[PDB]
Enzyme design. Structure first.
Site, PDB file in Angstrom:
ATOM      1  N   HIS A 216       0.674  -1.109  -0.224  1.00 42.84           N
ATOM      2  CA  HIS A 216       0.081   0.068   0.000  1.00 42.84           C
ATOM      3  C   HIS A 216       0.817   1.334  -0.009  1.00 42.84           C
ATOM      4  CE1 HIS A 216       0.307  -0.122   4.447  1.00 42.84           C
ATOM      5  NE2 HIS A 216       0.203   1.355   4.393  1.00 42.84           N
TER       6      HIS A 216
ATOM      7  N   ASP B 121       0.737  -7.466   2.234  1.00 53.38           N
ATOM      8  CA  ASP B 121       1.078  -6.292   2.211  1.00 53.38           C
ATOM      9  C   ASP B 121       2.715  -6.369   1.892  1.00 53.38           C
ATOM     10  OD1 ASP B 121       0.225  -3.140   3.591  1.00 53.38           O
ATOM     11  OD2 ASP B 121       0.997  -3.586   1.601  1.00 53.38           O
TER      12      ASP B 121
ATOM     13  N   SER C 104       4.300   2.391   7.713  1.00 59.90           N
ATOM     14  CA  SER C 104       4.197   1.370   6.849  1.00 59.90           C
ATOM     15  C   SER C 104       5.259   1.045   6.046  1.00 59.90           C
ATOM     16  CB  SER C 104       3.082   1.799   5.840  1.00 59.90           C
ATOM     17  OG  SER C 104       1.761   1.547   6.581  1.00 59.90           O
TER      18      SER C 104
END
Ligand SMILES: *C[C@@](*)(O)[C@H](CCCNC(N)=[NH2+])NC(=O)[C@@H]1CCCN1C(=O)[C@H](N)Cc1ccccc1
Ligand SMILES: *[C@@H]1O[C@H](CO)[C@@H](O)[C@H](O)[C@H]1NC(C)=O
Length: 234
Positions: free
Chosen positions: A43, A88, A180
């Site tokens: 992402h 992810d 992230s």
């Protein structure tokens, strides 16, 4: 990251920062893997990613800071959800390599599979309170907790998916918006890529999800070597 302090200036030579050709705000981190490859969260992808390596302070430049751009980006395509969040992870190939140095160094991929109760450390340039971005990366320590905690709170993380559920059950310590793709480091190896958790960050009884790097070891290594037909671990 929340409930920690400034990282030691030499402790994060594999930490890279991701921002976009249009904006200077760090939207994700990543981990340097060798002279030409960064590991990070799917992402975190965007259209004109820029990558800053050998950075610590946003404001005081280092000797050996480098800006790079992607030449290849690589995803898992066999994912349980169309948006790919159940898996992810992404690899970026740098336009030009870098050269190692005090503040640019490849992290170490796991070798054994480590689990519940291990001691791990998290880092990044994401939020440290309710709406602040620090100018230097923050770090703290967490533990792998039992997966059960994560499942009920995050649909995109089914039972027995390839993740580590981690944090501090009581609150205070956790990653946050903008962390992230950053490494989860246990015994000096990257076991984790920060995937997500709950907003606001570090709330009581609410650990976060880390992609279990160890599972993707082969996928990562084929991708590096040149193979383009290889699939993510099922
Ligand atoms: C994109 C990353 O900056 C970010 C990491 C934030 C993790 N924070 C905490 N509290 N530990 N990831 C998120 O924004 C990801 C991607 C989009 C959704 N997401 C979430 O954290 C959601 N709240 C749901 C979620 C998705 C995947 C895995 C776990 C939870
Ligand atoms: C490419 O991808 C897969 C890895 O499982 C396999 O079929 C093949 O051995 C790989 N190697 C090469 C050199 O193409």
């Amino acid at each position: 990251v929340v409930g920690g302090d400034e990282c030691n200036i030499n402790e994060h030579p594999f930490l890279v920062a991701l921002y976009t050709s249009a904006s200077s705000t760090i939207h994700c981190a990543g981990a340097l893997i060798n002279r030409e490859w960064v590991l990070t969260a799917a992402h975190c992808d965007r259209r004109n990613i820029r990558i800053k390596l050998g950075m610590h302070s946003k404001n005081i430049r280092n000797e050996d800071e480098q800006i790079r751009v992607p030449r290849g980006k690589y995803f898992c395509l066999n994912t349980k959800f169309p948006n790919g969040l159940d898996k992810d992870i992404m690899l970026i190939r740098l336009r030009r390599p870098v050269t190692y140095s005090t503040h640019i160094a490849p992290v170490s991929l796991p070798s054994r599979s480590r689990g519940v109760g291990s001691r791990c450390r998290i880092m990044g340039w994401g939020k440290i309170s309710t709406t602040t971005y620090p100018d230097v990366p923050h770090c703290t320590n967490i533990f792998i907790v039992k997966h059960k905690w994560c499942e009920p709170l995050y649909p995109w993380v089914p039972a027995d998916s390839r993740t580590l559920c981690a944090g501090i059950l009581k609150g205070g310590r956790d990653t946050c918006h903008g962390d992230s793709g950053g490494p989860l480091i246990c015994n000096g190896e990257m076991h984790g890529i920060v995937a997500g958790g709950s907003e606001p960050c570090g709330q009581h009884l609410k650990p976060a999800v880390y992609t279990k790097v160890f599972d993707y070891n082969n996928w990562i290594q084929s991708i590096i070597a040149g193979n383009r037909t290889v699939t993510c671990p099922p």
